[PDB]
Assembly symmetry: D2
Homo-oligomer: 388 residues x 4
């Protein structure tokens, strides 16, 4: 069969300890699950399963995907579960949900991701007991999200390795970062994010409506060039040319093409292929290169056939290398900005860029699109979408 994405939605990407500083991830997920149902004309009672990628669920309780679905009104007869492939969790959950319908084990899937890096706690193993001496409380965000398990250094150090192997200077990375901020600021002023964003009510001394990405700001090349390196003491990656820590959620609604036709739904696009490949963890930023090539081969497309591309900009150094290797037209890649300016909610980033890719394809009439991300531990994932 053929699987389509009938609708999509996402929250505003909040800043670290910002708008969603005390909002649990499943509360953000419930808002997005409710949104994709209303935008497609599908009642919650018709959902079979909810697949939400999430990387930092410590302290959220039993199965936060189930909590988000129940809060969204999905009936108890349906099932829900989370999955963790780091930064590709949000996009991989869509591929997994697509397979549920392809094998005939489900009819309607809500797939996506959610992440609240502000709510990540500090932890320590204390069952054995500390007989003597000092011990460390571990930041679960750094440990389970931003630190390579094999080599021990931060993910930003991996971007420094890509910068050396591809010989990307500090000036070329700052130019990529400033260009990313300007494309995002222009898209926000023109309202190109209003379609995909669903407003979220932060209930507090009065409720607050969060409707815009609080990370999108105006950047200047001079202020960027003054920043000190954030990882290597004599390195190239800074806080300006690297993605930020963020909160948010995003999801999509999946069904077969015949099911959408019977319901009179005009889908956002049809999933034509997908792929996931592993690379060396030292250069995990090069993940999207073999993943995109494998997805295009599975779809039968050449790189020149793509009308629009959404590649997640974890770091300026990795994103420059991905565009250089694949050699696609940079004018069709992240036309509304990227994670360097909008933000990077790890569990939801895969579904976030998939939202931007779908609405921009319908807005400009693009026929063939591709979304791809790099994954910590040395992996990449990509998906090809054709418009309907």
């Amino acid at each position: 069969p053929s699987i389509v994405i009938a609708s999509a939605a996402r929250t505003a990407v909040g800043s670290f300890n910002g708008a969603f500083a005390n909002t649990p991830a499943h509360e953000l997920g419930a808002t997005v699950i409710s949104a994709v149902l209303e935008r497609a004309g599908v009642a919650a009672g018709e959902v079979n399963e909810v697949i939400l990628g999430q990387v930092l669920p410590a302290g959220e309780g039993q199965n936060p995907a189930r909590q988000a679905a129940m809060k969204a009104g999905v009936p108890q007869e349906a099932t829900a579960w989370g999955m963790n492939q780091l930064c590709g969790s949000g996009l991989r959950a869509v591929a997994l949900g697509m397979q549920q319908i392809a094998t005939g084990d489900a009819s309607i899937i809500v797939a996506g991701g959610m992440e609240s890096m502000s709510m990540a706690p500090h932890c320590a193993h204390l069952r054995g007991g500390v007989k003597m001496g000092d011990f460390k409380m571990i930041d679960t965000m750094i440990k389970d999200g931003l630190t390579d398990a094999f080599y021990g250094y931060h993910m930003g150090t991996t971007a420094e390795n890509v910068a050396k192997q591809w010989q990307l200077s500090r000036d070329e990375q700052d130019a990529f970062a400033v260009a990313s901020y300007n494309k995002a600021e222009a898209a926000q002023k023109d309202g190109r994010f209003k379609d995909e964003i669903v407003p979220f009510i932060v209930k507090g001394k009065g409720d607050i409506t969060v409707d815009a990405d609080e990370e999108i700001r105006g950047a200047t090349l001079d202020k960027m060039a003054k920043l000190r390196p954030a990882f290597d003491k004599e390195g190239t990656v800074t806080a300006g040319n690297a993605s930020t820590l963020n909160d948010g959620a995003a999801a999509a609604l999946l069904m077969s093409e015949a099911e959408a036709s019977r319901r009179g739904i005009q889908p956002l696009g049809r999933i034509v292929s997908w792929a996931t490949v592993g690379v060396d963890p030292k250069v995990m930023g090069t993940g999207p290169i073999p993943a995109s090539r494998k997805a295009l081969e599975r779809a039968g497309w050449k790189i020149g056939d793509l009308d629009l591309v959404e590649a997640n900009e974890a770091f300026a150094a990795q994103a420059c290398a991905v565009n250089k290797d694949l050699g696609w037209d940079p004018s069709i890649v992240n036309v509304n900005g990227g994670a360097i300016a909008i933000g990077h909610p790890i569990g939801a980033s895969g579904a976030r860029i998939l939202n931007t890719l779908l609405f921009e394809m319908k807005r400009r009439g693009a026929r063939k699109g591709l979304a791809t991300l790099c994954i910590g531990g040395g992996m990449g994932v990509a998906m090809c979408i054709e418009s309907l």
Copy 2:
């Protein structure tokens, strides 16, 4: 296409703060991944993906499934990811791996689960800062594993609801518990667990220790069982004796198509013929296996009377009694080697663990049609039907 299970393996189920008290889950997972490869004659370089269910990964680092796969020798070109559907993660990961091969996106999958509840840390959100007063360090095992998010009480309280709704007395629950211990001790003495268990070497500073047997299997008496106080409700029926324990362990299986296994001369353990997952009310999450098993049997085209062997995970004695009563299958074919009440319940790996016991017991006695099923916290159930080859 048709997907088969070419081989399977599991570690010994360790006790809480016992043999694996300081062994991370991925070290247990790597041992099982290496085992299913050796038992099938398949090199690690042929694995496409590793899907490991895990419920308590806090503090273990980035994607423990990837760590376990790399330590097992799986090449970096392959992919790996974890999934969390609580107690059914281990069995659901097999169902997900079967779909990768069914859709043609992979050829060889290693699927299973791993859990180290002893290594679960205590946590607290400290970014905002505590200006004054006391705060609580939260046990991640209790919070994210054994506590219902909607009603707030322990999973044992949900079993009390099943005991009340089904009118299961304390005596019927203790009789089920002792019967579970006796079936497990007999299977252990007869060596019916040696085929599925892969030995694990616990490397320590003062000499290494080989863990080869389930550390929870012991002799139980009805007299000592009847004296135990209720562990959740002050005037309830669920005790520490008739409830499953907290444990560590890992289990996995190797998946491939039937034609691929035929080309390699592999004699598979069984064929996955159907599977299903259904949700129920969280108040009575133990009743999950009832609609899940019925849906799996219909998808397989089997009647309940067609089943030759059944493995139903015994989260609680009260929950397991209700499942056998409703489904009405022959209790002599259900958990013939014991259950989680005596063997243990490592949440993330328990789904694949009972799938291991079901596969090896089917081959030794020549059973044709089998079924594995579990209950899932939050009100869900999962079941899988296997046919021998």
Copy 3:
């Protein structure tokens, strides 16, 4: 023998998590110890011992009094130690230093107190290990400073007990609080605190800051006081406005014999003529100053009518009203420059703090006989009688 106070000094009393939010207590103590030596013309090599009262020393390292004395330039030949009688630590340390000289075991003592309640950490006993369940991180400031060990409630609840037995309404407590703020606001503008305060340099990463004035002194109106919610009892009288605050600071004095001061040409601030410490019921700890002051006056041979100036620590508005009513001294001579309700309450240093205000104000107006007194948690009181020279 006769013991005199040759000099005195104190830091500005900082707000909780304010100017000294990251300043250790011994750094505040070093500034005051060096100050009392420079104000008296005495080299550090002449100090015999340093006695610094401190209540919350957890996490500051080995013997913070020794650290404060060494950082102040006192040579290693001298000795230093801390003592803990809660809120009366600062004043009791002066009485102890007086006894060292009286018994002939020392010649020159630096005595006082220091407290940094902002730097108090959260703690938990973790050696035995938490096998399962949640536990609480204890605020050492609340536990070891502001919580009665026998009854378990906050010190503010003891003030509620004083309010009931003495029939103290909210209006009389707010009127005392507003009167305390106004006397402190008037004294600060007139510069009556400049002599006793030594400036403290808060060295920071983005420029240094000089702290020279008490940041807790604010303008209070009786209307704003009546709008405050009760802070302890849900239907009580003590609020955050009529109770002292949590603060950081240090204060000290320089002690020597009267003949020693004469040989060095020092004009002393005053002569210690008597002191006393008495215990009371912990339920009504606020009445501590009543029997302690009576015993000190009896030991000195003074009547209440002989006192020209009185400093009674205002831990709570309810406690200070009961002390003034029972002892019956002229309220116009009690805390003429305000009290802890407006200035602040650094627990370890509060005893020496009110001694600083009493000494400098006595010389400013030519008072002959003075008395300082405090209430102590756990049901104790301490008082000292001072005569001008």
Copy 4:
């Protein structure tokens, strides 16, 4: 102005995380306060003040000295407070109580120390908030007890500095340690500790346990001593065998004037003749007892040859060897029953502990002149001279 010690007592010195692993210090302190009152025939209502040295009071509540006195039956009218001069706190509290009676401010004092190093918690300053990254939970026992605030290394490193200045080999330190173990093993078998030790009832959920013997006394052999690796310096001399251990316990004495004991028919253990405290370089804090003992003897009018019994705290074998070498007193009269290397070193109570051993051993053999002394972290020493009656 003559002060005598009417009675004394101490608990069994428990091992780190041993018998008193969950016993708070004030509970041990209460047992000793009750014992010295019955051993002297003094009612609790006659005690004026309780002075208890304590070094690690974090998490123990408001003023543990007051809690210990209240639990021992001392009335609320009495006063109590703690003091901290590290390892010399227990002995210094006796000197402070002696001064209260000498200055006429008290008649009957209970002085001593208490310490439960097992109950010391881990702490961290969390008020400002941890925005990102990991932080350290600090062990209050290591930080506030065993770490030099000026140089940052362990107290065992300071002993290495003393071993270097006196050129003390590993062989000479291990021989000194074994001699202390053997002298302690002989004293326990001969029952020379029963008079001073008061039994403590450890009330638990699973039966009460009576602790009446020091559990660290084991008896050592030089072969096992020479095989131990250095505990501080990678190529050092101090090992776990020749260094004192971490322990829990309490000890106290009862002070009064000589006319008071004669008026009550009390026969005192001994008369306090003099005391002294001196500071030294913190790098060589082990040399503390050398100027302190010489100063006390000079103040008492005694020559070193006059001492019939000497109790010098063996913080480390390297430190104790240098002290015996400098004063040159007869090694057969120094620590005749062993020392802290074998019995243990409870920081807050160690000063009063060696004072207990000295008083009872003086009576057992009829010694007339004794001396107790300890070294103090941060570069200090304290000593006291006792004359029998």
